[PDB]
């Protein structure tokens, strides 16, 4: 729980992006001209008032000051988007000069700064999208061996979601092999954007080919997720790290918000919204309230603050 401060660059010669500082003097690692590549830069609030005073004397950029005891990724993003009246923001940069130990921010994408100039821009949407994450396990299937959609209304609602310019990401924790048969039974390849599998487990991520039968164009959902917590518990969170990774692999580079729809609250690590799926061995046809929830969650920022 700390006070916090942020740079706002005068000329966003590169836009949307933000950086995080351990020292005000870290600027020396950045040196000449490199500063023009970042729109904002957060720093933990000065302990010495002279630092803040020198900041106040500096004219090279605008700045803001605030309290954020809420040491959370999404809450900090909310506060910054409030301060700078902006719906969408870029990635958070990092250097070999290791970041400050604000390691509660551990679970996120980390941008090796030099890539920033190398970054592409993407066709995939003409406007900045929202994103929604889904599962197979007990999720929107009926629970029997052969599954209906909980409503064909939902079936077509998935398609219409494209009208809003929002992204559909399914990561089955369930086993890889059966999902192909599942989609052959009911195909949403024309209805859904992104597919991932085998997330069920956390595994010892420490230092110590597919589509042979039918020409699917899928991939090894490679196990590249850290143990990340080095502790005795039982949790397999959905990983914003991996999600943003595959997004930028699809050149998806900016977004307004991300929501999770899942049967496990535990896996939600401060996702913007969570929809606990109702378990359903029969077609509940309840979707309209899910629709309402999602629509209002989207609408939150039409007032220019999520609340």
């Amino acid at each position: 729980q700390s006070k916090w401060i942020c740079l706002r660059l005068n000329d966003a010669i590169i836009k949307r992006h933000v950086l995080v500082l351990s020292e005000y003097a870290d600027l020396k690692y950045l040196g000449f001209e490199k500063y023009k590549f970042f729109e904002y830069v957060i720093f933990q609030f000065c302990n010495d008032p002279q630092l803040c005073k020198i900041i106040e004397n500096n004219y090279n950029y605008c700045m803001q000051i605030f309290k954020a005891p809420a040491d959370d990724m999404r809450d900090i993003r909310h506060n910054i988007k409030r301060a700078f009246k902006t719906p969408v923001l870029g990635h958070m940069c990092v250097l070999s000069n290791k970041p400050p130990m604000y390691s509660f921010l551990k679970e996120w994408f980390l941008l090796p700064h030099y890539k920033v100039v190398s970054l592409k821009s993407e066709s995939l949407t003409w406007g900045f999208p929202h994103v929604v994450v889904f599962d197979l396990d007990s999720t929107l299937i009926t629970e029997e061996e052969q599954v209906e959609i909980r409503d064909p209304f939902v079936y077509d609602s998935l398609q219409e979601l494209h009208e809003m310019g929002c992204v559909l990401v399914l990561w089955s924790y369930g086993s890889r092999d059966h999902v192909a048969h599942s989609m052959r039974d009911v195909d949403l390849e024309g209805y859904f954007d992104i597919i991932i599998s085998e997330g069920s487990t956390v595994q010892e991520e420490r230092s110590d080919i597919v589509d042979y039968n039918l020409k699917k164009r899928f991939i090894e959902n490679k196990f590249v997720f850290d143990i990340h917590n080095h502790r005795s518990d039982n949790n397999i969170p959905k990983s914003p790290k991996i999600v943003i990774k595959y997004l930028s692999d699809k050149n998806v580079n900016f977004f307004k918000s991300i929501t999770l729809v899942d049967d496990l609250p535990t896996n939600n690590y401060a996702y913007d919204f969570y929809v606990k799926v109702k378990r359903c061995p029969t077609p509940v046809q309840d979707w309209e309230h899910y629709h309402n929830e999602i629509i209002q969650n989207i609408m939150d920022y039409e007032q220019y603050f999520i609340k």
């Binding site: 020396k28 690692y29 040196g31 000449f32 070999s96 000069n97």
Partner: peptide
């Protein structure tokens, strides 16, 4: 590069020498 600021420091010492004389 991490090399970069070392190059800049070397240039700095260089010019610091140069200007005075």
């Amino acid at each position: 590069s991490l090399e970069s600021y070392e190059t800049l420091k070397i240039k700095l010492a260089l010019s610091k020498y140069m200007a005075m004389l």
